[PDB]
Write a protein that binds this DNA or RNA. Sequence first.
RNA 1: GGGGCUAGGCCGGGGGGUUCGGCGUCCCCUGUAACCGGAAACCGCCGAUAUGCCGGGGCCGAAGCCCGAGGGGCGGUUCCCGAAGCCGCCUCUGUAAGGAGGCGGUGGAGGGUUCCCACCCUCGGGCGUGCCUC
Lengths: 90, 82
Amino acid sequence: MVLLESEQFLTELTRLFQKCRTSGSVYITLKKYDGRTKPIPKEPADNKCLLRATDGKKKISTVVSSKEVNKFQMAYSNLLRANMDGLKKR
Amino acid sequence: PQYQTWEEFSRAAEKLYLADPMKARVVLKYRHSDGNLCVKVTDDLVCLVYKTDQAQDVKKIEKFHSQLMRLMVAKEARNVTM
RNA sequence: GGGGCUAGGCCGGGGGGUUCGGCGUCCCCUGUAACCGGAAACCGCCGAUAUGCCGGGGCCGAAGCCCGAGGGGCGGUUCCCGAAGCCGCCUCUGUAAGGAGGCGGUGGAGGGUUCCCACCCUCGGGCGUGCCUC
């Protein structure tokens, strides 16, 4: 699965939205993250969160620490605004 | 269960994330073709869901996502103010 | 108990459609820290021993995987009623290129149900729980 740094992620997420326009669901899922690259038998950083996105076919994700939230917050929010058009308007 | 009122959702969702932040996940499903949106928050024990056709809510959600991100990245989330 | 192996295991799971039938490419519902590339609908790989095929790779490692039952839970689904909204007929209004009923459609908000079910927890089974060395 394509793990990306925030830039390409936002570039790639953009893409997904646009290809599920006449047909398709876009899932975006978000979750506090350990750092885990391996399973848990019978390490951990506490300042990370994970973002996953897919349309069922291609999958992308990225990891966001305190270093980089404050920038990413806005860029992402704007991506959401710009692509989740197409609802009702009162 | 399902919520009709965004506030009642957002408040109860954050309560959950805090109660145990590692177990909880936050999902968003966007459906341009049908023109709906769905948001879920759960720890597999309890599930919380909100569905809309209301473009106003898009912005309401940006804030929710954006805060959750901030809370995830903090050491203890009960020390971050709201 | 420590150090090495290799047997295994994981790298997703459901439902629709379609098929005589099983997987897949299509549509939909859904997970993980977690695969990559290629070909494929009047088609690709199969035959109830079917639950995809070809090529590359990562991780775990005697780890584990399988079966059943119970509970949480998401999306479906069976059947039994049923609300807004719309179409037409006929009353009573009384001039609003309109209203209020009655009637039959159309329609399916929301109940009570049947059978599945991603994801999570517990209990009970099955097979394995090896080799070299210290």
